[PDB]
């Protein structure tokens, strides 16, 4: 096979089944601000601090001081690594030389490689040297000289590529001369930007072909890990207590399955948030830890509103079992939102997760995007064994349980009814049940 | 007096080209980066040596042989073994070019040639007429030498090739394409030109998996259905009894429509369990619930899907629609149905694809699925949460409808093609004894 | 009226109102694999075979043996014609490189006494002219030369990146321009031909789909001149027939059987076809969701034995899939089979299986052809004003049981029953009551 | 003001309020086959045969023999005019001269002008001479030399322009140097081609700015005449007899207004075609002449079908009062269809015009195109005083009268009812009326 050098970006390495190709040049293309320089920096830094592989960073415009300080904010301590002689930075600048001896660069490169003992290399803005080459055949020959140099030396090299007016690179050659080609793009849609990565080419390995949204937060380059893939869900035969005993009773077995995904759907003011809060509070009382993701209400406001029904979510927030997360759709974009959901869930290790409401994303993306991000969330939760409570104003087919709460007018008065529409794996009551809200909470009438 | 074809060993490609590539003539596999031109040419050579003994030479102008060999070693091409057996050679590099090629060919007496990165030379020619003359010189040399050549071409910022002339100088031109839509990449092959023969003019999706370069074969053409008189047992004897003759015809396509919690997955599980208990092998494609979850939920109704699975008769496949494209979904389905050769297939629910494509794409996919299963005499069950009765030989509508604050479960036998069927509506009950219709 | 030379493609000659312009050059433009070379080959070979007009194929790049073999499969049999001195192929080659070309041409044309010429891949020469003025001046010199000699010439133009040709001038210097394009839509590729310019004549200006089949370059030639007959047709359901004054529908009519699934659309269409075959008429049944054996099996349930008629050769059952080769291609296949079989009754089941405007045009054309040929057509659907008769078959829920009823919603030119008729399906078939 | 030289294309001259500008150069741009050469030919020919204005046709590639024969099919008898010395053709060809004395062309031009006494000039494929000029400033200067030459001589000149890759002309200069610029385009939509003309520029005059569909039939360049514009309708206080006396009675005054537009709408088999045929037959019996435009039925078939109801449309067809026109939507494109409708109506001078059905165009164009072409037809008819009967399966607001024919099921039987929904300018019955079809025709029950 082909050897794989890992980068340290967990999601990227997973999608590439081990990382970049070892002893070969890799191309990371994109426009300005897409993440190519930071990806190469992370490649080098993680190669040193996770695989004892020293690195050299060749820069043709960006100053070495700039290169270290532009990552100091991510705590990479590149200044540290440079003083410790695990990473070196070689700066090459030109001006009258460009009109027209690349062996000099080869010598300088080899010298830095030997000083640091480098096994990984980064070549940033090679365009500064190769934009002088006007004839395409000559440009191709020289790029081949450089890439074959690196191959011979067996250095794992990440080479930057400016997209310019082109689909991958300005001149449209390095994408064909490289063995692994990655595209980073920063696409805006309805004033919202999303970073996406794509493995366009990778000889000698399978990988993910699709576009994969990624992130450059204060924690650096980060990709959604495919590990939490779909349909590997944990199956539990134990049941969950919802906090509404009269609902829990309607099902044979005493309640919904643990790690089940249950959709509470209805009209506004029908009790969806109330039921979800009941779920979370029952879990926290049992001693589990729960997450409540509000997208329409503030955490303090939800605690208040539920106080009216007798749920003291504040007690759980203080104990540290319940964690509220309030965020509106426009802020934290759809992929951003998926990422924060999954991440904060990993950190808190909840047992029950409530999404109130999953309709808040209905108007923030086409049917496919909304449905697919919801698929990802539900798969993540069930693979972790988390009981998910999704409130809503096709999803029913995706959910393990379905509760419908209706405040309907009859004879000049609104009555609240509850339907258990779906409850896979059990017998359950077909009978509509009237339900009342009060200080005692949600109750069901005979 | 048709032309002569040399097969590539890619079943789908050879079926679409009616024999393979033009023999003794150069073809042009155009494509962007990572679309599979080099892999298609490598497969051409490897299948030539394995299936028909025709030695092969891979002439690369820029990439090195060890890199070629490692690039394909992960797919089990055993290039190194073939080079030692002197069946395949990998040589690195206009009369001089011709001599170097004759050398590379003499290494193993190659009958199949591949030209990788011919752009190294042809980018030097700036004048269009000169470039065209040289290209035609090379292509005519390859025509006369008695070798079947596959030439890779770089699309670049072009429709097929970067300079836009080799596609016109060649006689067989195939575009390899990797198009993204809704973040999903689909690999497609197209025959843009093929002089001397009929062939598939449409776009055809293909995979580059552990099986290599693979095109779905159109040998499962539509409307060649296997027609059987024998009936298939549903596992619900009252349902099968509603139909004169004992139930649905074997090899039929049967839709099970309804609202969530209506019993569609349950009826389909009854079908699969009945088949496995008869000793036939069944396949449950679940697009929404994991295999173990489905087994658990069906145990409640009293079906030991787990027993049938461990017996090897039942194959569960859990697959999220959004993970692939619709074309790739069809390809994966059909491939696994081939590998398993089941008698009963379940798709639970096909409605999970409607979201992932417009009516035309999903309808075509379901056309191909039903045509495949019926051409093989496989009874297909499709659950649904819309005019799909077009492709369905049978149709069962399961309702869980509210009356007086109570939900009654009813069954409609809407379509029973070719048989007297009860058009009455039957109330049913679900229990540990399964699905039972009340008399 | 300009002088025209037929190409031999029925549809193309009909569209161009006689064919290509005589003694003048024509420009067949297209991207790679669109059919310009085959079009030119057909021009020449049909010229020699149908009109005795010898031909010369001047190729600047492609080899003559390649030219012969790339068309041998189509039965054109060019090699015999070269031996017989009806057609010639002349290979002009160029490598790092004015009237000498004209000299060689003239020699070629005189060897075989050619009145038709093809010029394939003049780009070999015209790609070296950088100056646009120079290039078009040379193009004009060539076109003039050909017009002075009076040879009907088809010139191939490579579209390349351009909209017609790579350099964008031959389309202006030529008098007749035909753009062939192989356009993909939903992974389905359709070949279209368009007469961009044809000086001196009216002609079809739209895009016309064509097919390069194993028979070759083919275009489908329909109109609103329906053949009118009073004769009445037996439906197989004599009571339905009786509901109509005189005893049925008009022979040549177009009928729509509409309803839900399991309503009896295919049953009624099979009844029509079986009645026709029984009285001795050739009937055709185009299904787009059912195999022929499946149809005979399912109709034997109601008592129709279509196997009898199929074996007798009176019934021809054809099964296709709509999503394969595009709507106009379908139309073409259905049409060719109707032409072959000269059926009295044609069935299309379901027509709903076939975007909106395309399907509307296809259906209008099918009805037009059947009517003009005098054939009665039974269309099934899961239009009402485009047909002549309309039968609505209902399987409606009443008291938790589906009752089966029939409406005769439309029957142009006759008094029918405004009454609904409850109908029963049984081993004997379709029956009704008042 | 500016002098206007008419071309002979009635619609073009109307849209330009008199034709091209006199003594100035005009540019007719377009791709191949759009109608520029034929427009210039018509310009010259009609200038000679309608305004005693002799012409010269300068051609730079197309042979003079070709130029005459390519119009012989239109009966222009250009060979005649050339022998009679009213039009001349001057052919200029080049080849080695193009690499690099335009005064020679000026001399040749002036000589032809003086021979024929020309007042109109056409310059066809000036590109053959001016494509040699590479520098844009020099090309502009030379084009200005030529156009100023023509201006000085006061010749009304039509200059061809090849569109090429450009929006109007290949080099993008003549459109700015000309005083009148016209664009001819041949746009395909759903495999159907439509010819459109546009006055892009015309200094010194008002004109139509919109795109105007035109035609090149066997009668040559032809434009829809805007003269039959909208809302100048003829207003009649006399009434029409529909042939259904019981319908005519429901309206105060004895029937619909003459020159009225009446929409018969309903379900299939409801009697729309029958009522329309009754209208046409009543008119033809009165002695008027009527047109019946079928888009779903053949003329013989419609005569048969109506025979069943007792209308002998064959008698009227034979008398010459009734004229049938059968054509399907796809054939005779939407603009094509408008054109044939209007034209054949002008020729036949009908009194009643039936369009059966105007729904046949529902699926052949977007709502705006269908509605606007229908607007044009209705305006044309009412401006001529023609009574229009439009059958159908927003238009109601456009129609002067509205009849609704419904075959509705009740108690397992279909009954036919007739509603007079609208009838401007009169009192009319609000009562639904049952109607029966028989050999006696359409009758209404008390
Ligand atoms: N220290 C940092 N902290 C947070 N975000 C950063 C940091 N550095 C860069 N980014 C984000 O990642 C992007 C990466 O920029 P960079 O890769 O250096 O430029 P390019 O991709 O053009 O080479 C920036 O545009 C910014 O949005
Ligand atoms: N003490 C109480 N007694 C009765 N009803 C209450 C009480 N407190 C809150 N509610 C009801 O709860 C509703 C809000 O429920 P909520 O959980 O927000 O449902 P949704 O999520 O559908 O908006 C209010 O409309 C109100 O009728
Ligand atoms: N061993 C492998 N396993 C799976 N996929 C592979 C393997 N080798 C190559 N591929 C696929 O083929 C693509 C490269 O094919 P190749 O023909 O070499 O590229 P190009 O189209 O640039 O010539 C990669 O993007 C990858 O998805
Ligand atoms: N033992 C049982 N008794 C009664 N009903 C049951 C039993 N087990 C499962 N069910 C019913 O089966 C339903 C799940 O059926 P399923 O096959 O998932 O239908 P669908 O696929 O239409 O959602 C539950 O809603 C429940 O009502
Ligand atoms: N013998 C044949 N049988 C069927 N189809 C053919 C045959 N020869 C050529 N074709 C078809 O004709 C198309 C174009 O042929 P050709 O005219 O040579 O292309 P070009 O546009 O380069 O001239 C091909 O795509 C192929 O499908
Ligand atoms: N022997 C029979 N007795 C009663 N009904 C029958 C018999 N054979 C077939 N059928 C009916 O015919 C129907 C199939 O009719 P079909 O022609 O397929 O209608 P459609 O084309 O509208 O689907 C079935 O639903 C079935 O009820
Ligand atoms: N004699 C004719 N009879 C009918 N239609 C014609 C005639 N001559 C030309 N046409 C139509 O009008 C168009 C005008 O062509 P022309 O104006 O000469 O070319 P261009 O517009 O490229 O200069 C032709 O493409 C053809 O469709
Ligand atoms: N002699 C008759 N007696 C009764 N009804 C008739 C007679 N002749 C024709 N019809 C009726 O005329 C209808 C056709 O009317 P038509 O004018 O085509 O209406 P539409 O234009 O709405 O289709 C048929 O459905 C039929 O019921």
Author numbering:
A (entry chain C), D (entry chain C): 2 to 101, 107 to 399, 411 to 463
B (entry chain B): 1 to 93, 108 to 399, 410 to 463
C (entry chain A): 2 to 98, 108 to 231, 235 to 367, 372 to 399, 412 to 463
What did the study's authors say about this model?
To further understand its role, we generated a truncation at residue Glu490 based on the phylogenetic tree and crystallographic information (KaiCRS-Δcoil) to disrupt the coiled-coil interaction between the two hexamers. Nucleotide exchange rates in the CII domain for KaiCRS-Δcoil and the wild-type protein were comparable (19.1 ± 0.8 h−1 and 18.0 ± 1.5 h−1, respectively). The phosphorylation rates were also similar (5.5 ± 0.4 h−1 and 7.4 ± 0.3 h−1 for KaiCRS-Δcoil and wild type, respectively). These results indicate that the extended A loop and not the coiled-coil interaction plays a pivotal part in nucleotide exchange and autophosphorylation in KaiCRS. By contrast, little dephosphorylation was observed for KaiCRS-Δcoil, for which allosteric propagation was disrupted. Consistent with this accelerated dephosphorylation rate mediated by the coiled-coil domain, our crystallographic data showed a phosphate group on Ser414 for KaiCRS-Δcoil but not for the wild-type protein. First, KaiBRS binding to either KaiCRS-CI domain or KaiCRS-Δcoil (that is, missing the C-terminal extensions) resulted in disassembly of the hexameric KaiCRS structure into its monomers.
